[PDB]
């Protein structure tokens with residue numbers, strides 16, 4: 001029965017604690033957990049070897065369907081070469097820009113009963129990429145499921161304790177066949193239905209991944225000139241990601257980039273055979289709504305046919321209305337690790353990787369994305385200037401390269417094969 | 419010498435204290451003061467009969483050119499029938515919608531040496547109206563000067579003590595002849611130059627009055643549905659005049675009324691032979707600026723040629739940027755006086771009078787002002803509904819009529835005579 005399948009969760013961020021409780025609440029399944037040997041991973045590795053129990057609390061509205069819970073972990077590993085045995089479901093709970101690096105380390109031959117791979121918070125192209133790797137390992141039978149985003153808001157640091165403040169209202173998902181009635185899809189639905197989360201099946205993996213909010217919203221905000229300056233000059237007074245100038249990036253040019261990047265993704269998706277979303281309807285009706293006195297229902301329903309300038313006005317009004325807890329989101333800065341090496345924070349590092357992969361894919365398909373190109377040009381120039389200030393020898397290698405090129409190639413190969 | 423002329427200030431709000439100090443600092447002139455016999459007027463009447471001295475303090479930036487000062491009042495009256503004698507300058511420091519009621523009570527025959535009448539914070543049409551009345555009293559010689567607005571921010575309640583927080587950067591003024599070089603104009607300039615206030619002379623009275631910010635900004639904000647509801651249902655949680663919905667009125671429909679009313683005034687002014695202002699340049703460059711990252715210089719310079727929707731976007735951005743101390747301005751509610759009679763607060767009562775007078779004038783000239791008409795229709799219906807809730811017998815007469823009709827007629831008569 002699918003709600004008893006031994007399940008290995010790859011990545012032990014706070015979402016994995018919520019997820020683990022949700023699986024254990026839905027059936028009696030053996031649960032495995034992986035986390036890289038960071039300092040946090042090591043402390044959780046030590047803790048679990050003593051008491052293999054994670055703890056979760058529901059908070060605010062989430063308390064309606066999530067109370068104090070505990071869940072047992074039957075196996076914990078910190079090396080993916082140890083991801084072996086009778087596991088039948090892998091769930092990728094690492095960020096999407098790390099799926100490739102993770103999947104390349106899994107010894108697929110040592111997972112003879114593997115049935116499904118779930119992408120907990122996907123990006124556009126994630127599913128095609130994962131299909132391609134699995135097909136190369138002789139795992140074409142395995143069901144690949146992309147979820148449009150993680151289904152909650154969950155936070156820690158005691159690394160075995162988390163709390164969930166809120167659940168999303170809906171998640172879009174799909175497997176590579178567009179088969180809505182699969183046992184795994186039914187299982188996921190049951191898992192999410194415990195928190196009143198609707199599940200909406202899509203025709204293919206990309207047709208679900210297109211509903212990843214952060215691909216639309218983060219790059220314009222996080223890669224604005226003033227946000228990049230806060231990021232790379234850590235001594236400035238803090239900026240806030242969703243506030244208007246001069247406290248944060250929101251302003252007409254930034255909103256123009258938000259609208260233009262949505263235009264770019266429509267171009268890319270359409271080329272890939274996938275319909276574009278209605279960005280404003282998605283933001284308002286699937287994520288966080290604002291009063292109709294600010295953003296009219298006409299603006300929402302007709303957004304894709306509105307002229308650019310009216311699209312922009314509507315989006316500026318939306319983000320203004322939002323701030324009346326978006327106003328608390330700070331812009332994180334570059335930072336040094338224990339070896340004194342400089343890092344980028346996950347915003348924008350993850351967003352740059354996700355968008356670069358898609359920009360490289362678009363170029364391979366003869367699709368121009370001028371807003372995406374402008375955004376990454378601006379980031380890359382600021383990053384180069386930062387590396388020169390601090391010295392390349394003092395930068396973590398993540399600042400100096402990535403494997404977006406190989407990913408775009410893999411995604412292109414898989415898509416053309418269909 | 420014009421800086422020694424005996425001067426009678428009509429109206430003793432806090433601005434009159436600043437004004438009185440400014441006159442006394444500029445020359446040795448006998449100073450008179452009028453205030454109606456309100457409770458505040460009576461207390462000031464009593465105080466001055468004991469110690470005829472007003473007190474002023476400069477505050478924040480105003481402290482650069484205004485320190486602790488005192489000024490002696492040589493004559494105080496509370497009946498306009500006592501506005502008689504050798505006064506050579508009258509300054510109307512009452513609100514513009516009360517010029518008519520005041521001027522009709524002045525015994526002009528008993529002011530044989532009257533040389534000038536200054537409108538401290540004018541409205542459009544004020545000067546034409548005052549000219550007409552003076553001409554009827556045989557005072558066509560008297561110089562009529564409209565100032566676009568009061569030149570500072572001044573507040574009290576000890577009615578003989580005020581404080582000024584800030585001075586304006588420029589004031590527009592004119593006399594009926596467009597004669598920039600008059601001794602009175604020079605005197606006013608000298609008076610305002612002590613606070614680094616620029617004075618900009620205009621071709622005629624209306625060509626200065628067109629720079630009255632409150633005629634443009636107050637009616638859309640104060641007469642918005644949600645603001646009228648706060649005004650007439652005093653038990654609601656307070657609204658704020660400049661905040662976005664739902665804490666205040668700012669939203670796309672309200673901004674659309676701001677832009678549309680400016681279009682209406684352009685129609686009316688043009689009919690009267692006067693060029694319209696650039697609203698956005700005036701707001702930003704003559705009143706309170708916002709960063710160019712929010713409102714571009716292109717938006718400011720080209721505002722009158724921008725399409726309506728772009729005008730609106732620019733204005734919404736402007737008012738959003740303003741809130742990053744506009745955010746402290748509360749919407750005042752209806753209130754009862756000592757006799758338990760209901761009143762409107764000065765916002766919107768003054769604004770309704772000023773706009774109704776102009777709407778009646780426009781109709782006489784065959785000029786349509788649809789936004790002005792919609793705004794006053796909405797106000798009048800809400801006012802009628804309020805009077806029914808409380809009872810007409812429990813309403814102050816100001817709620818039940820006005821003399822805007824006679825004023826529009828007088829203004830029309832004066833204008834046609836030219």
Ligand SMILES: NC(=O)c1ccc[n+]([C@@H]2O[C@H](COP(=O)([O-])OP(=O)(O)OC[C@H]3O[C@@H](n4cnc5c(N)ncnc54)[C@H](OP(=O)(O)O)[C@@H]3O)[C@@H](O)[C@H]2O)c1
Nearest residue numbers: 011012013014015016038041093094095121150152153154
């Ligand atoms: N939690 C939420 O409310 C939320 C909200 C929005 C999106 N999401 C998405 O949902 C997924 C799970 O998020 P999460 O909040 O549980 O935790 P997370 O911060 O995304 O990290 C999850 C796991 O990936 C590892 N990780 C993070 N960055 C890494 C990097 N540069 N390189 C290698 N490993 C890295 C982490 O290791 P360490 O923990 O040892 O550092 C962790 O084991 C992610 O796809 C995230 O994007 C979650």
Ligand SMILES: NC(=O)c1ccc[n+]([C@@H]2O[C@H](COP(=O)([O-])OP(=O)(O)OC[C@H]3O[C@@H](n4cnc5c(N)ncnc54)[C@H](OP(=O)(O)O)[C@@H]3O)[C@@H](O)[C@H]2O)c1
Nearest residue numbers: 429430431432433434456459511512513539568570571572
């Ligand atoms: N002070 C500022 O910073 C400021 C800012 C913007 C505009 N203004 C303008 O500058 C002028 C002077 O303003 P102010 O602040 O000194 O005081 P004010 O509140 O405008 O009142 C000035 C005088 O007019 C009387 N008054 C007010 N409303 C009246 C009404 N419905 N009926 C009869 N009399 C009335 C007042 O009598 P009582 O005092 O006895 O009630 C007072 O003697 C006005 O044109 C005002 O519109 C001033």
